[PDB]
Scaffold this active site. Structure first.
Site, PDB file in Angstrom:
ATOM      1  N   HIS A  43       0.781  -1.242   0.000  1.00 35.59           N
ATOM      2  CA  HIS A  43       0.000   0.000   0.000  1.00 35.59           C
ATOM      3  C   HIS A  43       0.817   1.297   0.000  1.00 35.59           C
ATOM      4  O   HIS A  43       0.240   2.385  -0.105  1.00 35.59           O
ATOM      5  CB  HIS A  43      -1.016  -0.003   1.144  1.00 35.59           C
ATOM      6  CG  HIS A  43      -0.458   0.471   2.443  1.00 35.59           C
ATOM      7  ND1 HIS A  43       0.140  -0.343   3.370  1.00 35.59           N
ATOM      8  CD2 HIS A  43      -0.383   1.726   2.950  1.00 35.59           C
ATOM      9  CE1 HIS A  43       0.556   0.424   4.388  1.00 35.59           C
ATOM     10  NE2 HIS A  43       0.260   1.694   4.178  1.00 35.59           N
ATOM     11  N   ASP A  99      -0.672  -7.414   2.212  1.00 35.86           N
ATOM     12  CA  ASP A  99      -0.181  -6.076   1.982  1.00 35.86           C
ATOM     13  C   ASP A  99       1.326  -6.188   2.099  1.00 35.86           C
ATOM     14  O   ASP A  99       1.868  -6.003   3.187  1.00 35.86           O
ATOM     15  CB  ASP A  99      -0.732  -5.174   3.079  1.00 35.86           C
ATOM     16  CG  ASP A  99      -0.280  -3.756   2.951  1.00 35.86           C
ATOM     17  OD1 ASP A  99       0.389  -3.433   1.953  1.00 35.86           O
ATOM     18  OD2 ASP A  99      -0.610  -2.952   3.850  1.00 35.86           O
ATOM     19  N   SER A 205       4.079   2.991   8.148  1.00 36.54           N
ATOM     20  CA  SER A 205       3.781   1.915   7.209  1.00 36.54           C
ATOM     21  C   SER A 205       5.028   1.300   6.619  1.00 36.54           C
ATOM     22  O   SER A 205       5.906   2.013   6.163  1.00 36.54           O
ATOM     23  CB  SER A 205       2.919   2.424   6.068  1.00 36.54           C
ATOM     24  OG  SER A 205       1.560   2.455   6.427  1.00 36.54           O
TER      25      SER A 205
END
EC number: 3.4.21.5
Lengths: 259, 103, 49
Positions: A43, A99, A205
């Protein structure tokens, strides 16, 4: 990273930073597994809802950093990317299932007192470490507070940050959210009224969720900071990509004739 | 509520909220909308007010003049200057050859 | 490369240099030094269950 403390120098030799080219901004974080391969969360590169599908010509990597903004000449190594490998079944439309993404540095880097790869966990290692109540480490240059300039001072770290957080039992992870948890993702955090706090936040992230095998004294990367509902919220947890499950795919990519 | 419009990826993708405020990414910008600000809309990507454009290359100061030409045809004072340009002035630039740019 | 005892998993030729000597920090492990909050982890390897 929410509710943490400044990191030490050389604490995370594998802590890679994903830097956007234009504008010159922070995107996410990542990990170093070899002198030429880098691991992240898909992502960070491909997220259609944001009209986002970055190519190699859209970002740079930065390793051996401490201060998140100064070009640390004495140690920082900047790299161009050769190939990006997003997992074929990355479920970005429903719950970011799978992910993950691999990145190949266009030119192998030099290891040093500030640059070193994390070990990927093997089956045996996955067995003994992944247990509710056991702690792992998250580090990143992302937000320190939630709503951009939320309560005390600035919300951006000056140096790398760290927090140690507890693995949570699957039923509790599933109970905390209304999103379809999968077997390719674990959650971590401190229960409410447990005293302690801490969590990942916008900017982290891709950052490594690490654990230290007492067996061989090495550091392993169980997960990847993926998503969550707000930062450090009560009754909510942070969700990480269960790296070990997807190991079969990394092997495929790297060993299916890299170079 | 019921934990859904605020679940979001922890990626940075700053956008400027119509309320004159910066949002970590388009997801949070939406979550805010679903918690009191229905009128909230985006206006442009990038923070509302530019960041404190500081001295990133602050450590190359005092470097002896030894120009090298970058792939962008800009003759840099010295390597350090060049290296730093790649994360600021000339995103991704790299050493073409030592000495001034041939023009 | 099978060093003095590690279990490398990927091919060094396609993987690159690393795995064999991975997870042993130059500034810490190598010098038997611990970091400030390191022990917190080793302590959870009990009360956790």
């Amino acid at each position: 990273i929410v509710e943490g403390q400044d990191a030490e120098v050389g604490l995370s030799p594998w802590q890679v930073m994903l830097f956007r080219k234009s504008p010159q901004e922070l995107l996410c974080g990542a990990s170093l597994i070899s002198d030429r391969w880098v691991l992240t969360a898909a992502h960070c590169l491909l997220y259609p809802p944001w009209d986002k599908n970055f190519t190699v010509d859209d970002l740079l990597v930065r390793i051996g950093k401490h201060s998140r903004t100064r070009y640390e000449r004495k140690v920082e190594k900047i790299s161009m990317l050769d190939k990006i490998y997003i997992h074929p079944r990355y479920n970005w439309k429903e719950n970011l299932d799978r992910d993950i993404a691999l990145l190949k540095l266009k030119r192998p880097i030099e290891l040093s007192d500030y640059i070193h790869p994390v070990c990927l966990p093997d089956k045996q290692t996955a067995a003994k470490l992944l247990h509710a109540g056991f702690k792992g480490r998250v580090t990143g240059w992302g937000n320190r507070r939630e709503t951009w300039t939320t309560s005390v001072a600035e919300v951006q770290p000056s140096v790398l940050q760290v927090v140690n957080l507890p693995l949570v039992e699957r039923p509790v992870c599933k109970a905390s959210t209304r999103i379809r948890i999968t077997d390719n993702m674990f959650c971590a955090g401190y229960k409410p009224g447990e005293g302690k706090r801490g969590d990942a936040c916008e900017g982290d992230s891709g950052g490594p969720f690490v654990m230290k095998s007492p067996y061989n004294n090495r550091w392993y990367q169980m997960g990847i900071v993926s998503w969550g509902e707000g930062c450090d919220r009560d009754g909510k947890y942070g969700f990480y990509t269960h790296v070990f499950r997807l190991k079969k795919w990394i092997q495929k990519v790297i060993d299916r004739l890299g170079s | 509520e019921g934990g859904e419009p605020c679940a979001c990826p922890h990626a940075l993708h700053r956008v400027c909220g119509s309320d004159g405020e910066t949002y970590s990414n388009p997801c949070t910008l939406n979550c805010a909308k679903f918690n009191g600000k229905p009128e909230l809309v985006k206006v442009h990507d990038g923070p509302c007010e530019p960041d404190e454009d500081e001295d990133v290359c602050q450590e190359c100061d005092g470097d002896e003049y030894k120009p090298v030409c970058g792939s962008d045809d800009i003759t840099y004072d010295n390597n350090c200057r060049l290296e730093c340009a790649s994360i600021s002035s000339s995103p991704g630039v790299e050493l073409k050859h030592e000495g001034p740019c041939r023009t | 490369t099978s060093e003095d005892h590690f279990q490398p998993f990927f091919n060094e030729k396609t993987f690159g240099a690393g795995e064999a000597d991975c997870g042993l920090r130059p500034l810490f492990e190598k010098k038997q030094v611990q970091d400030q909050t390191e022990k917190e982890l080793f302590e959870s390897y009990i009360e956790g269950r």
